[PDB]
Design an enzyme around this catalytic site. Structure first.
Site, PDB file in Angstrom:
ATOM      1  N   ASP A   1     -39.406  82.970  50.297  1.00  0.00           N
ATOM      2  CA  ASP A   1     -38.131  82.949  50.825  1.00  0.00           C
ATOM      3  C   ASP A   1     -37.366  83.896  50.303  1.00  0.00           C
ATOM      4  O   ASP A   1     -37.630  84.598  49.461  1.00  0.00           O
ATOM      5  CB  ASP A   1     -37.548  81.440  50.715  1.00  0.00           C
ATOM      6  CG  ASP A   1     -37.342  81.182  49.048  1.00  0.00           C
ATOM      7  OD1 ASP A   1     -36.278  80.385  48.673  1.00  0.00           O
ATOM      8  OD2 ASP A   1     -38.275  81.458  48.192  1.00  0.00           O
TER       9      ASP A   1
ATOM     10  N   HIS B   1     -28.254  63.598  51.108  1.00  0.00           N
ATOM     11  CA  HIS B   1     -29.240  62.692  50.306  1.00  0.00           C
ATOM     12  C   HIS B   1     -29.721  63.569  49.209  1.00  0.00           C
ATOM     13  O   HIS B   1     -30.058  63.025  47.963  1.00  0.00           O
ATOM     14  CB  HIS B   1     -30.290  62.507  51.265  1.00  0.00           C
ATOM     15  CG  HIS B   1     -31.136  61.450  50.926  1.00  0.00           C
ATOM     16  ND1 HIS B   1     -31.062  60.456  50.042  1.00  0.00           N
ATOM     17  CD2 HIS B   1     -32.659  61.716  50.799  1.00  0.00           C
ATOM     18  CE1 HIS B   1     -32.320  60.004  49.432  1.00  0.00           C
ATOM     19  NE2 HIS B   1     -33.348  60.970  50.126  1.00  0.00           N
TER      20      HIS B   1
END
Length: 330
Positions: free
Chosen positions: A243, A174
């Protein structure tokens, strides 16, 4: 500890190349992985060498949560998945034992911290699953608080993840980045809010997840999430990690230097580059020289050997109880 960059090393022993890079002032830490672990004595020798080469204090970290995320297994006590504590009749007692045991064994091998605990809510996200302490706010808070108490008891700094909540993340086609399209993530963020307010988190690791109702950027590179929310709305005062900047699946943010700049501008105090020595070097060669003095708070507060640790009845019992807990629910 003083520089912002965490990097990693190739193997079981420190190379001459590694020793040089560890002296670069931009370096603040080393993250260890399974490929860096053979046995207890080899790990002690590696960490001794890292500290010798660095000269100044440096942080050594690892992902050691228990269950599916435990880098150092052979010669360590096995720690159960976080999910198991709340399934037991004395889950809070056992969660504290798990946190204490995990932490104590790392400290006994000259590691400063584990990137733990997981504060994500629910088991439906495959990447998280049984790494979560529970499926609702109260269960997560109850058992993660206990685990945190255990880590703090032995002098290990704590790291909540993955802010603002990875519990309901979808990673299909998506969008180009894993995402959470919920109009509200109030319950998930309530867990982080409560732990920040209790003052039990020394650091925070953000999710590389897009929350499109809130902001276009993954939380880990988002000025909204890391400044407006984490600092201004929630009042977090600790260290914010990035991250792993060696990966950005959308592949729209440029090279490692540009990604590093954005993480710092977004609100990260420290940046992580794993598995890519050439990217780390590019960052080292280009980033301004900066210091993160507040990161000294992450250095471990206790020092002892594994032999000394094992003389504690607390160790004897915790290690035996963790094995029984694993056998109970496996």
């Amino acid at each position: 500890s003083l520089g912002p960059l965490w990097l990693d090393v190739a193997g079981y022993e420190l190379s001459a190349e590694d020793r040089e890079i560890l002296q670069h002032p931009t370096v603040g830490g080393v993250i260890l992985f399974g490929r860096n672990y053979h046995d207890n004595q080899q790990l002690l020798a590696l960490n001794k060498a890292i500290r010798q080469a660095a000269k100044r204090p440096i942080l050594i970290g690892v992902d050691q949560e228990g269950g599916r995320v435990q880098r150092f297994r052979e010669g360590f006590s096995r720690i159960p998945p976080a999910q198991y504590y709340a399934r037991a009749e004395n889950g809070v007692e056992l969660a504290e034992q798990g946190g204490w045991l995990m932490a104590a064994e790392l400290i006994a091998h000259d590691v400063d911290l584990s990137f733990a605990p997981v504060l994500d809510m629910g088991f439906a996200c495959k990447a998280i699953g049984n790494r979560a302490f529970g499926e609702d706010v109260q269960t997560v808070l109850k058992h993660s608080s206990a685990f945190l108490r255990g880590m703090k008891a032995v002098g290990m700094a704590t790291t909540g993840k993955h802010f603002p909540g990875h519990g309901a993340v979808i990673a299909d086609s998506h969008l180009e980045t894993p995402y959470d399209e919920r109009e509200t993530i109030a319950q998930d963020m309530a867990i982080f809010r409560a732990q920040i307010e209790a003052g039990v988190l020394d650091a925070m690791m953000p999710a590389h997840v897009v929350y499109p109702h809130y902001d276009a950027q993954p939380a880990s590179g988002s000025s909204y999430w890391l400044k407006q929310v984490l600092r201004e709305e929630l009042g977090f005062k600790g260290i914010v990690f990035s991250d792993d900047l060696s990966m950005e699946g959308a592949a729209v943010m440029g090279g490692p230097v540009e990604r590093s700049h954005q993480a710092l501008v977004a609100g990260c105090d420290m940046i992580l580059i794993c598995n890519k020595r050439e990217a780390a070097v590019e960052v080292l060669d280009n980033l301004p020289i900066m210091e993160v003095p507040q990161a000294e708070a992450l250095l471990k507060k206790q020092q002892f050997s594994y032999s000394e640790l094992k003389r504690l009845e607390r160790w004897q019992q915790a290690s035996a109880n963790m094995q029984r807990l694993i056998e109970q629910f496996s």
